[PDB]
Amino acid sequence: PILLFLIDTSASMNQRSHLGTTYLDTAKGAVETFMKLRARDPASRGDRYMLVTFEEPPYAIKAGWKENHATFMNELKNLQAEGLTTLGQSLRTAFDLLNLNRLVTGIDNYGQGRNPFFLEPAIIITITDGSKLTTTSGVQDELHLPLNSPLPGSELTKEPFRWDQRLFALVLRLPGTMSVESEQLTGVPLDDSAITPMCEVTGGRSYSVCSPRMLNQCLESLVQKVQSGVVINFEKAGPDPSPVEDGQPDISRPFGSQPWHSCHKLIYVRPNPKTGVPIGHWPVPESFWPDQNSPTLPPRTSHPVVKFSCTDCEPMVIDKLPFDKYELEPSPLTQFILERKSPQTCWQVYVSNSAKYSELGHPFGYLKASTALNCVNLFVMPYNYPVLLPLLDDLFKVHKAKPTLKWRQSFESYLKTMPPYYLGPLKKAVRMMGAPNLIADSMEYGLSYSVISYLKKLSQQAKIESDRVIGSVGKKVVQETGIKVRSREYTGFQVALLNKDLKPQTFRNAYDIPRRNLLDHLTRMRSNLLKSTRRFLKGQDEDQVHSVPIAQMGNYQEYLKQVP
Amino acid sequence: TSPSYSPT
């Protein structure tokens, strides 16, 4: 998966703990221990770790997707605290980079459902202290994500993130003195910050830390949290389900929207161990009917908003049907299902406005408790499966893949109710049950040519944007000698600032060598020039730069002694 | 041929 680290470089992390260490250094150590744990995980070969600061672009991004571990180490360690708490701008730049990468890859099936097997699982960790937001205008009390998007095509989604990106916020609350209280907490309390609502919306648990021990607990919690799945909004459809008759009727039941009625949850999408690619067959229906005459498409949400009808119904199964079974994250919803203890029934799941005439649409899947009652799994079938499956049963049990005209017209009415993009997976499903001529090759309900050309031009502009981001990434800060304007040698004067990367050439240039060392350097150049060996040197102190490698020294040297 | 300080 993709690992991204948005790390604050505001002067707030120039505060120090009781350890004598700054918050910035604590963040760097936490990231180091994180990637050590991620290398302990064998998925480190698939892991990629990129870095974003809070400073203005083009220097906002530090490590691009083409960069390696050595450059990533160098940048993360050589970060310096000079920025401002511009959390909204930094988060916007990071999620803009993620969306640019996604639309460059083009797996975003806009207007064609949402394929669960197309995933780009990215986890972004934002490290802050939880101080107030800073802006050149002033202070800001709310995390206002900026609405002006120079990136084209961001209007196709209402939210800047997608369902495959999970954001987790670390909040540094280490006290100035040593905490006399010993932390007996076995869990991580939630923070109270403006990043917390956006964290919960995108599907993350923002953590606030106070000691290194529970910091390690938070870090290993995130390490266990590194998985691949889909973030889905779950909403209860229809009335409340029937309470279990084995328990007393609770008078004190709250009459309102439950968290298990409406909780945002992830569903794990386990890739095929044989291939390493996640496998799915049926995308979720869209929240609008796919119109072949519409020149524009409605903007879809970041997360698929589905509605589950709590009516217990029999999960019907027909052999050789390609269905998508995925395992859900534990939740109040899954807890309520496993409290109901009904693995033999299932609750239907729908997508609103999936049909032309039906607001709720037709059922496309169900949630079903596992046989061992340890979890709840989502089973995704073709849309309007209670209509399609009896037709398939009649065709392959009576008609023997030779459809009658009444079956053909019933199936065609089902196709008319069926949303246009599903024909492909339906064609593959029918050809793997064994009737490839049941659906002809002539009809293909494609999208409108205006939307297709708009998407192609959007992809071209995304390629241009990715090229210019690739060019922009890796550029260090530019130190200025600009003209300082002041009133009370004609208005264009600048006093030069001191540069650490000056590297004066005392031997080549005479305007170096200050007065104290003048005679000694003079004798030094004279000794150099009147020695005049094969090699002449322009720098007196060329000791080293950063590291001294034994392997590199032995490689530059030769050893003519095999001694076998 | 050096007429001033090198960085500036």
Binding site: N14, Q15, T136, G176 | -
Partner: protein, 165 residues
């Protein structure tokens, strides 16, 4: 020795735009009400309005770090006019000496950013060390924070009382 008449005189001078005398009599009012700032000033004398009055007076007197410190003395910090005060380069009141007296992490962060932006490395180093003081960390049990704020209030007020009159 009457804080009310002191406020009356200083407000009259504020009306007549004699800002030096206005600060002089405001400070004399504070020294009347509290035993030369050895205790915390009572807010019924140092109300929000009066503090805003010396905010405007000090801003027109061009002591911008001082008006930032008084912004910190406000009950709710007016970071906008604080940044408006630190924006100008025409100051008069020893920025690198009152970076000791400032005790708010946000204004210190703004100072650090502005010093780096305008290439003022030594003052930026001073601000970073002042932030790195362990006295304030914005995560403390707030008793130490209130005590440190009171101590810096006392020392700063005695500094202005030494400067004026």
């Amino acid at each position: 020795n009457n804080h009310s008449w002191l406020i009356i005189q200083a407000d009259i001078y504020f009306a007549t735009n004699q800002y030096s005398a206005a600060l002089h009599y405001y400070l004399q009012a504070g020294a009347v009400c509290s035993d030369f700032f050895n205790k915390a000033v009572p807010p019924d004398v140092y109300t929000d309005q009066v503090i805003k009055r010396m905010i405007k007076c000090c801003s027109l007197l061009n002591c911008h770090t001082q008006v930032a410190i008084l912004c910190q003395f406000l009950r709710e910090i007016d970071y906008k006019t604080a940044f408006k005060s630190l924006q100008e380069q025409n100051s008069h009141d020893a920025m690198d000496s009152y970076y000791d007296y400032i005790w708010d992490v946000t204004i210190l962060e703004y100072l650090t950013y502005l010093h780096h932006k305008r290439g003022e490395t030594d003052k930026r180093q001073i601000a970073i060390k002042a932030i790195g003081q362990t006295e304030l960390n914005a995560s403390n049990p707030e008793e130490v924070l209130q005590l440190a704020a009171q101590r810096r209030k006392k020392k700063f007020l005695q500094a202005m009382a030494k400067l004026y009159f």
